[model samples]
Target: QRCGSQGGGSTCPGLRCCSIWGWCGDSEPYCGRTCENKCWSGERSDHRCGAAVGNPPCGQDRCCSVHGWCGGGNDYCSGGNCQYRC
Candidate 1:
């Protein structure tokens, strides 16, 4: 989905990040320094990550997946997919 100015203030769904270009995803290209929203830097009371959850950082040792879920497996902790503690 698109977000920021291009999306008419609309945000991404799930834990995806909104890039400066208004694109949504969980990779560095979307959630990195240029991210405009849901950038996995805030606190989440639900202990989740992604656009749905407002892109909060993952809990303890868990990794935030590109899809916005939190886990400790390869899918969640591998390379660019993992938003936190990767």
Candidate 2:
């Protein structure tokens, strides 16, 4: 569904949080890199990473570069082993 303006505050459930542009999700695009506009009015959890499980969490095909970051290409070794931050 098309998310509307979260005037006061709102959530998206499961992966729930306010977006930078006023929506609801849990990924970086929704919660932002540093959660610049994240509205944790009633959020269940905190920002997480390392296992692709939080706001600004790692992407499926990338490496958890830093705390809550996901890097691809040269930043990580791509292969079956998938050695990250190498």
Candidate 3:
């Protein structure tokens, strides 16, 4: 059958199943924003900014940081003009 033929997979991730710094669980913090364009090469960590990037702290900086061993695949998100994954 065709993919999404029934339009019943809105809640389903389909093929876009990935997360970083946080999970997509109902109780998890939503990293609704985007990330660096290259998560596989960028850093990985639980990052949060009071404001958006280029505003303060790490401005316009494509960076990521992870403690201990990184997790499966890539953890990241894409927001406005960045890419990140863990």
> Global lDDT of each model?
0.68, 0.41, 0.25
Q: For candidate 3, give the lDDT of residue 15.
A: 16
Candidate 1, TM-score vs. the true structure? 0.52
The segments of candidate 1 whose C-alpha lies over 4 angstroms from its true place after superposition are: 43-71, 74-86
Q: What overall lDDT, based on C-alpha atoms, would model 3 receive against the true structure?
A: 0.25
Q: For every model shown, what is its TM-score relative to the native structure?
A: 0.52, 0.29, 0.14
Candidate 2 residue pairs that clash: none
Q: What is the Cα-based TM-score of model 2?
A: 0.29
Model 3 agreement with the true structure over 1-86: per-residue lDDT tens digits = 11122333222121121223322221112222332122222323434422243211111222222322223333322332233221
For 1-86, candidate 2 gives per-residue lDDT tens digits of 12436434543433334465656655556544534243333222342434455443334334434444445565443553233322
Q: Which is the winner by TM-score between candidate 1 and candidate 2?
A: 1
